[PDB]
Amino acid sequence: GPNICTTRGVSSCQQCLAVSPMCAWCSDEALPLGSPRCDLKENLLKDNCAPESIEFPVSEARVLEDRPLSDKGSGDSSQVTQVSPQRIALRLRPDDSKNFSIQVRQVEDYPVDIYYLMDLSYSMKDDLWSIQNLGTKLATQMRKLTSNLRIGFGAFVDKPVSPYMYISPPEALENPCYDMKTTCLPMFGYKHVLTLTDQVTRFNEEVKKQSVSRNRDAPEGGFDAIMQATVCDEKIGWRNDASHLLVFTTDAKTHIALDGRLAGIVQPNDGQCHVGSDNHYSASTTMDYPSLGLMTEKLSQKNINLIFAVTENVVNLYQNYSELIPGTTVGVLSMDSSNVLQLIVDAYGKIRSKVELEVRDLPEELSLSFNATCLNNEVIPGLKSCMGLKIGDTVSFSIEAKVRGCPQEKEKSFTIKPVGFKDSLIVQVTFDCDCACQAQAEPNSHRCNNGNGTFECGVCRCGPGW
Amino acid sequence: LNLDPVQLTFYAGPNGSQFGFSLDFHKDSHGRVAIVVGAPRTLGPSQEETGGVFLCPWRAEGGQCPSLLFDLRDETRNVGSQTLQTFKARQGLGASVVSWSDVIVACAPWQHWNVLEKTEEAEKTPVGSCFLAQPESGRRAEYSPCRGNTLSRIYVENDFSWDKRYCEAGFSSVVTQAGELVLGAPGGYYFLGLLAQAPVADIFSSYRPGILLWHVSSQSLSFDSSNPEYFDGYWGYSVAVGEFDGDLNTTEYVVGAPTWSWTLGAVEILDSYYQRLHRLRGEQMASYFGHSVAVTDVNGDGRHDLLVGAPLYMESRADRKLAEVGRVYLFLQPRGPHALGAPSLLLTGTQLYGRFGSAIAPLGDLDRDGYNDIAVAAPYGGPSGRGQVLVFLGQSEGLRSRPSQVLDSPFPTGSAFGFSLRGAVDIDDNGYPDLIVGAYGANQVAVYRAQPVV
Amino acid sequence: EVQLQQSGAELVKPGASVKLSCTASGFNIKDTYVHWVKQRPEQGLEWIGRIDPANGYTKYDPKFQGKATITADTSSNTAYLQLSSLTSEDTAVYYCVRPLYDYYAMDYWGQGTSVTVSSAKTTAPSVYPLAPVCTGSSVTLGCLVKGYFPEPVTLTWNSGSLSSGVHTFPAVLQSDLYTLSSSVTVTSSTWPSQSITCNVAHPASSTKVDKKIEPR
Amino acid sequence: DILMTQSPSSMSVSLGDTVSITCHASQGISSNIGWLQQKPGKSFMGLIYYGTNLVDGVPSRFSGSGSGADYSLTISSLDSEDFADYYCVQYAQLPYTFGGGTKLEIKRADAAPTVSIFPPSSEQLTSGGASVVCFLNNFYPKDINVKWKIDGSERQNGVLNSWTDQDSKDSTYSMSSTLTLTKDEYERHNSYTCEATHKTSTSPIVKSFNRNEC
Ligand SMILES: *[C@@H]1O[C@H](CO)[C@@H](O[C@@H]2O[C@H](CO)[C@@H](O[C@@H]3O[C@H](CO[C@H]4O[C@H](CO)[C@@H](O)[C@H](O)[C@@H]4O)[C@@H](O)[C@H](O[C@H]4O[C@H](CO)[C@@H](O)[C@H](O)[C@@H]4O)[C@@H]3O)[C@H](O)[C@H]2NC(C)=O)[C@H](O)[C@H]1NC(C)=O
Ligand SMILES: CN1CCN(C(=N)c2ccc(C3=NO[C@H](CN4CCN(CC(=O)O)CC4)C3)cc2)CC1
Ligand SMILES: *[C@@H]1O[C@H](CO)[C@@H](O[C@@H]2O[C@H](CO)[C@@H](O)[C@H](O)[C@H]2NC(C)=O)[C@H](O)[C@H]1NC(C)=O
Ligand SMILES: *[C@@H]1O[C@H](CO)[C@@H](O)[C@H](O)[C@H]1NC(C)=O
Ligand SMILES: [Ca+2]
Ligand SMILES: [Ca+2]
Ligand SMILES: [Ca+2]
Ligand SMILES: [Ca+2]
Ligand SMILES: [Mn+2]
Ligand SMILES: [Mn+2]
Ligand SMILES: [Mn+2]
Structure with a gap:
């Protein structure tokens, strides 16, 4: 019987395929005048259509790269596979929809970078003493989770400029603690101390040579240091294939963007690296503190996991900042940082307990829909993220792409990548809207109104200009 | 709507002087309008940055402006077995300017101060200072309400109570119609923030050069607090005045505290005795809600309305992602004695990092339709990031949600076009109020003339 | 208007203590410094010390360290000067001072509180007539007020009738007691033609004696 | 302490005279000096502060000057009320110290007693x-x-x-x-x-x- 393919009354092979994904076209010459060329593939064969002249594309999805998920992230020159498959080919005819799958694994024994960024205002003097053995203690505990560990150290106070800085008497510049009964370092904004290295005893010995300074106002310029520890890739030394942990320890409020105007500083933060050979942030007195949005952009651009390890008197403050910077973790730091070791381990486990899919370069005409399979084979519709995972767990997602109409460009490609992961799934899309018989059309055909038309796929079409 | 973006007027200052960081219209004793411009990094005598002030006469061609000269020499007075010291190096003279009657008030928020008594000292701190000038007569006066002579040890004993050493007075400024100068000092009381008020007439009559420490008896300062909600709140980052209590004899104060309550931000409305009438809380932390405040009646009911800028507000977008664009809040004053409710209107920026809401200038009635209008600056907005100023027209129900006119920066990148604004003054005497826009990054000021509606 | 209203004159004994007061009128005492100054005819003016009533901190000339104690109560808007172990040298007029504009100046002054230290009891004066000796066109009489305490005394002639042409000299301290004198000059035809009387009133002991001048 | 030597101790002058009182200090005080007036049997009134600045309400005929350690008070055209005592006071250092005083007296012809x-x-x-x-x-x-x-x-x-x-x-x-x-x-x-x-x-x-x- 008649269907939407015939009742629409199409004029060409291209218009026939655009009716519904089920329509097919018969380009055969020996076809009755009353019989339609645009019907189901069954009805065309029923009416003795030559099988070679049947245009009927089928939406499919085949894999091109299907490396197996690695059992260990240890070893290798980072030939580790966290996402499977890695690349597929997708074919879609107008208004149709095909579906495929993706596998994501939190690989065991993955390398880790941990850069210790420490408040070194005067109230952290006790804290410096209790982390003098943190490098070796941390190496012992992280050895249970990874075999490629690197650690580094940086320190901050505040912008060394009035009024954050005491500027009188002249003795106070060399020794801010002069009017007490001790000595402390001159004020410094942010200084890099130790590049990420696997020789953990270098952490202990660099820390043992550190000492605190002193400034005037309770908020401290730690956000200046977070930005520099993020964008100065080569100096801090983050590795390409590793988890990046930025441990931020402080016991005070923090300065934010536009605070710098109280020092005469109005130039917005540029998000660039300004730590030279002397390892000090050279724009501290000339460039304003960074904004939360600019920090989020750079932390995401460099795959940095910021960790707010703060004391209980400002936990609520930094927990609220953490909600404006997604992917950030908060832990409660003791008044002398004696618990920072367990804080880092709990944060590292919490960081790798989530898989969250993300899409890049999706065409406008394509819409996606996901189903998550976390825990034990439990399907969760309309979800593209799992939580509560452990190291070694594996999840999967069922994806369906739905195209609207047919786009102009026939070959595009987009990406499915979990947040923070190195690997990704590339989806090479092809929009099969045309018919093969069009590539052999007869322009100015002598079958179509004395050369006033074109003969393609067994019909006459009005040529260009008509 | 009807600002002319084709034929602008450009005033310019020295290279690197940050000419245009602050501006205002100034009328002389004859009503002839000029433009006072602050350039807080103008070089002084010792080739060191001290700031400077310029008084630009109105010329359609613009150009250079003569200086409004002030004393730039550091002062020292040995009195009362003490040594008083002022330090004007990098003080930022012209970081704020304001005009009232035939008097100009230009302030240096980072002028430093110290008091030496034998081996002790008060500590060299930025109390700030304001310079007052009557250009036609040459009269000069100063006002520095946070200068003290208390030594450093005393502040430590009393747990830093009433510590006005880091005031930075003149950070923001405004003058009531009655002639009372109101200074914002965001670092007063150990960075809680304070306000200093004193009649302009009494500042002149009580000032003599060289005294450095003198009493202004009619002055009135706000109060310290032991509430941590005010700690590091920068109360007085921005200031404005208006009528909000229904009593036309009292003048009310509007104060911006953009880091109030752990960087939540706040704006408070007070009487002339600093008693709090209302408090508007920020919507989002670190958005700098209160960076700029503006007072004008936008809906033609005679009751002043309040506008607050949060230039760092991060708008919610798809896929749980935030985007810093900035936001402006409109509060319509209710009929009679009633609290300002929720915002009537929310204007949110479009360009990432554009800082929509960094400055808000009442324009008066631009299109002459009976409703006052405003201009909102996005100093790094526009599709190029060069800066934009957007005009929103008043209506019976508040303001239009979409702009009637957008002014793209005529300056290169980094000019901070729009960082300072000022309108509601007819400078060419054509019957329409005009707009002046500062671009301190380019050391220039642009004058937009309003023309008949097309 | 700025006015400093001090306490009334004091009359105390040596070794005791006294506390002068300086009340602010038309302003808040807390606004400025408050000084205390001592004035004596021979020694002149001397600066005692100051106080900042906002916080109570004081400074003193080391000469007055021990006797002077300056305090202030912002409630009653008053500043005080306490003097202890009083001596005959503490007999002086005491002023409180505050500046106008300059933080360190001495511009506004109170009316001054008189202080007198003496062991003398309330003694009534001894009035003596002074008639000339046994000639010209002008004659001069006199009246001696001796040995009274405390000050002051009111002296007239003929009960205020004879006023012009009179010289009443300041009192002088003569061994813890005061001695005063007064002269008067008229024409020879007036005296002893017309009776001339010396009217002396000492309100302290409440005595109003009158002596008529009789020739010799 | 800083000694203040005020000269002269007294002067006999007439109405309309332009007179000058001086005050010498034992060290430089840099205009940190005031001038005072005490009318007979009355309290004190401020005349000058910081060497030259007139106290509010004081007539313009009064005028202070000087620098370093030598200062002067000048009264142009004496008025019948100007005959009174005058003192200087330095406040460059603590303790504050005063001058000996100067009394303006009415001049007239000599007369035998x-x-x-x-x-x-x-x-x-x-x-x-x-x-x-x-x-x-x-x-x-x-x-x-x-x-x-x-x-x-x-x-x-x-x-x-x-x-x-x-x-x-x-x-x-x-x-x-x-x-x-x-x-x-x-x-x-x-x-x-x-x-x-x-x-x-x-x-x-x-x-x-x-x-x-x-
Ligand atoms: C980090 O972020 C959190 C979350 O926003 C902040 O906590 C909020 O703080 C504000 C300000 O104090 C609170 O606002 C108040 O809400 C009260 C409602 O209480 C209920 O709310 C939650 C349930 O969601 C419970 O925790 C709570 O026990 C109650 O069930 C009102 O009672 C308050 O009204 C009074 O104060 C306001 C001014 O704020 C007046 O206008 C009112 O008229 C009235 O007098 C007030 O509205 C808010 O409830 C807090 N939320 C939570 C979840 O705790 C932290 O302050 C912030 N910390 C830092 C350091 O930034
Ligand atoms: C009674 N009441 C006391 C508080 N009050 C204030 N106006 C006030 C508010 C806040 C502060 C401070 N914030 O923070 C400073 C503390 N500092 C400790 C040393 N720290 C050195 C370093 O970290 O290097 C820097 C931080 C002090 C001081 C005064 C009203 C009256
Ligand atoms: C996600 O799961 C849902 C089921 O909860 C799927 O929806 C059903 O899919 C079957 C496929 O045979 C259809 O027959 C049903 O009609 C669908 N039910 C609906 C749409 O309500 C969905 O297809 C899954 N999506 C992906 C991408 O796998
Ligand atoms: C598409 O989905 C169906 C059912 O949802 C499933 O059986 C099939 O395996 C999916 N195709 C691919 C390539 O995963
Ligand atoms: Ca009012
Ligand atoms: Ca209104
Ligand atoms: Ca209008
Ligand atoms: Ca105009
Ligand atoms: Mn600190
Ligand atoms: Mn500590
Ligand atoms: Mn700080």
């Missing part, structure tokens, strides 16, 4: 005392020296002097000297004299009497 001696009254003698009184009324200038003589010989133990301020009417001065003796000692002698030495006469004006005799 009117001496008058008075023996003890009968009432005083019957009580055990004896005071001889010697008035010296209406003279100019103020400088005068009294000398008591018992039987022609000078006496200095027991004298009690007193002066009046410049009279409002004639602008002269007057003096009262009193010699107090016991009744017993008063009768050991016969002659009693008070000599007056004024610039109006090289010869001292003498007035005396003799006891018992009259």
Whole structure:
């Protein structure tokens, strides 16, 4: 019987395929005048259509790269596979929809970078003493989770400029603690101390040579240091294939963007690296503190996991900042940082307990829909993220792409990548809207109104200009 | 709507002087309008940055402006077995300017101060200072309400109570119609923030050069607090005045505290005795809600309305992602004695990092339709990031949600076009109020003339 | 208007203590410094010390360290000067001072509180007539007020009738007691033609004696 | 402490005169000086502060000047109210210190005094005392020296002097000297004299009497 393919009354092979994904076209010459060329593939064969002249594309999805998920992230020159498959080919005819799958694994024994960024205002003097053995203690505990560990150290106070800085008497510049009964370092904004290295005893010995300074106002310029520890890739030394942990320890409020105007500083933060050979942030007195949005952009651009390890008197403050910077973790730091070791381990486990899919370069005409399979084979519709995972767990997602109409460009490609992961799934899309018989059309055909038309796929079409 | 973006007027200052960081219209004793411009990094005598002030006469061609000269020499007075010291190096003279009657008030928020008594000292701190000038007569006066002579040890004993050493007075400024100068000092009381008020007439009559420490008896300062909600709140980052209590004899104060309550931000409305009438809380932390405040009646009911800028507000977008664009809040004053409710209107920026809401200038009635209008600056907005100023027209129900006119920066990148604004003054005497826009990054000021509606 | 209203004159004994007061009128005492100054005819003016009533901190000339104690109560808007172990040298007029504009100046002054230290009891004066000796066109009489305490005394002639042409000299301290004198000059035809009387009133002991001048 | 030497101690001047008071310090005070006025029998009023600045309400005829350690107060065209005491005060250092003072007095023509001696009254003698009184009324200038003589010989133990301020009417001065003796000692002698030495006469004006005799 008649269907939407015939009742629409199409004029060409291209218009026939655009009716519904089920329509097919018969380009055969020996076809009755009353019989339609645009019907189901069954009805065309029923009416003795030559099988070679049947245009009927089928939406499919085949894999091109299907490396197996690695059992260990240890070893290798980072030939580790966290996402499977890695690349597929997708074919879609107008208004149709095909579906495929993706596998994501939190690989065991993955390398880790941990850069210790420490408040070194005067109230952290006790804290410096209790982390003098943190490098070796941390190496012992992280050895249970990874075999490629690197650690580094940086320190901050505040912008060394009035009024954050005491500027009188002249003795106070060399020794801010002069009017007490001790000595402390001159004020410094942010200084890099130790590049990420696997020789953990270098952490202990660099820390043992550190000492605190002193400034005037309770908020401290730690956000200046977070930005520099993020964008100065080569100096801090983050590795390409590793988890990046930025441990931020402080016991005070923090300065934010536009605070710098109280020092005469109005130039917005540029998000660039300004730590030279002397390892000090050279724009501290000339460039304003960074904004939360600019920090989020750079932390995401460099795959940095910021960790707010703060004391209980400002936990609520930094927990609220953490909600404006997604992917950030908060832990409660003791008044002398004696618990920072367990804080880092709990944060590292919490960081790798989530898989969250993300899409890049999706065409406008394509819409996606996901189903998550976390825990034990439990399907969760309309979800593209799992939580509560452990190291070694594996999840999967069922994806369906739905195209609207047919786009102009026939070959595009987009990406499915979990947040923070190195690997990704590339989806090479092809929009099969045309018919093969069009590539052999007869322009100015002598079958179509004395050369006033074109003969393609067994019909006459009005040529260009008509 | 009807600002002319084709034929602008450009005033310019020295290279690197940050000419245009602050501006205002100034009328002389004859009503002839000029433009006072602050350039807080103008070089002084010792080739060191001290700031400077310029008084630009109105010329359609613009150009250079003569200086409004002030004393730039550091002062020292040995009195009362003490040594008083002022330090004007990098003080930022012209970081704020304001005009009232035939008097100009230009302030240096980072002028430093110290008091030496034998081996002790008060500590060299930025109390700030304001310079007052009557250009036609040459009269000069100063006002520095946070200068003290208390030594450093005393502040430590009393747990830093009433510590006005880091005031930075003149950070923001405004003058009531009655002639009372109101200074914002965001670092007063150990960075809680304070306000200093004193009649302009009494500042002149009580000032003599060289005294450095003198009493202004009619002055009135706000109060310290032991509430941590005010700690590091920068109360007085921005200031404005208006009528909000229904009593036309009292003048009310509007104060911006953009880091109030752990960087939540706040704006408070007070009487002339600093008693709090209302408090508007920020919507989002670190958005700098209160960076700029503006007072004008936008809906033609005679009751002043309040506008607050949060230039760092991060708008919610798809896929749980935030985007810093900035936001402006409109509060319509209710009929009679009633609290300002929720915002009537929310204007949110479009360009990432554009800082929509960094400055808000009442324009008066631009299109002459009976409703006052405003201009909102996005100093790094526009599709190029060069800066934009957007005009929103008043209506019976508040303001239009979409702009009637957008002014793209005529300056290169980094000019901070729009960082300072000022309108509601007819400078060419054509019957329409005009707009002046500062671009301190380019050391220039642009004058937009309003023309008949097309 | 700025006015400093001090306490009334004091009359105390040596070794005791006294506390002068300086009340602010038309302003808040807390606004400025408050000084205390001592004035004596021979020694002149001397600066005692100051106080900042906002916080109570004081400074003193080391000469007055021990006797002077300056305090202030912002409630009653008053500043005080306490003097202890009083001596005959503490007999002086005491002023409180505050500046106008300059933080360190001495511009506004109170009316001054008189202080007198003496062991003398309330003694009534001894009035003596002074008639000339046994000639010209002008004659001069006199009246001696001796040995009274405390000050002051009111002296007239003929009960205020004879006023012009009179010289009443300041009192002088003569061994813890005061001695005063007064002269008067008229024409020879007036005296002893017309009776001339010396009217002396000492309100302290409440005595109003009158002596008529009789020739010799 | 900083010494303040104020000169002169007094000056005799007339209305409309332009006069100057000076004040020298023991070290530089850099205009940290004030000027004061004390009208007769009244309190103090501020005239100048910080060397030159007029106190609010003070007439413009007053004017301060000077620098370093030498300062001056100047009154152009004296008014009838300007005749009073004037002091300087430094506040460059603690303790604050004042000047000795300067009294402006009305100038007039010289005038010899009117001496008058008075023996003890009968009432005083019957009580055990004896005071001889010697008035010296209406003279100019103020400088005068009294000398008591018992039987022609000078006496200095027991004298009690007193002066009046410049009279409002004639602008002269007057003096009262009193010699107090016991009744017993008063009768050991016969002659009693008070000599007056004024610039109006090289010869001292003498007035005396003799006891018992009259
Ligand atoms: C980090 O972020 C959190 C979350 O926003 C902040 O906590 C909020 O703080 C504000 C300000 O104090 C609170 O606002 C108040 O809400 C009360 C409602 O209480 C209920 O709310 C939650 C349930 O969601 C419970 O925790 C709570 O026990 C109650 O069930 C009102 O009672 C308050 O009204 C009073 O104060 C306001 C001014 O704020 C007046 O206008 C009112 O008229 C009235 O007098 C007030 O509205 C808010 O409840 C807090 N939320 C939570 C979840 O705790 C932290 O302050 C912030 N910390 C830092 C350091 O930034
Ligand atoms: C009674 N009441 C006391 C508080 N009050 C204030 N106006 C006030 C508010 C806040 C502060 C401070 N914030 O923070 C400073 C503390 N500092 C400790 C040393 N720290 C050195 C370093 O970290 O290097 C820097 C931080 C002090 C001081 C005063 C009203 C009256
Ligand atoms: C996600 O799961 C849902 C089921 O909860 C799927 O929806 C059903 O899919 C079947 C496929 O045979 C259809 O027959 C049903 O009609 C669907 N039910 C609906 C749409 O309500 C969905 O297809 C899954 N999506 C992906 C991408 O796998
Ligand atoms: C598409 O989905 C169906 C059912 O949802 C499933 O059986 C099939 O395996 C999916 N195709 C791919 C390539 O995963
Ligand atoms: Ca009012
Ligand atoms: Ca209104
Ligand atoms: Ca309008
Ligand atoms: Ca105009
Ligand atoms: Mn600190
Ligand atoms: Mn600590
Ligand atoms: Mn700080």
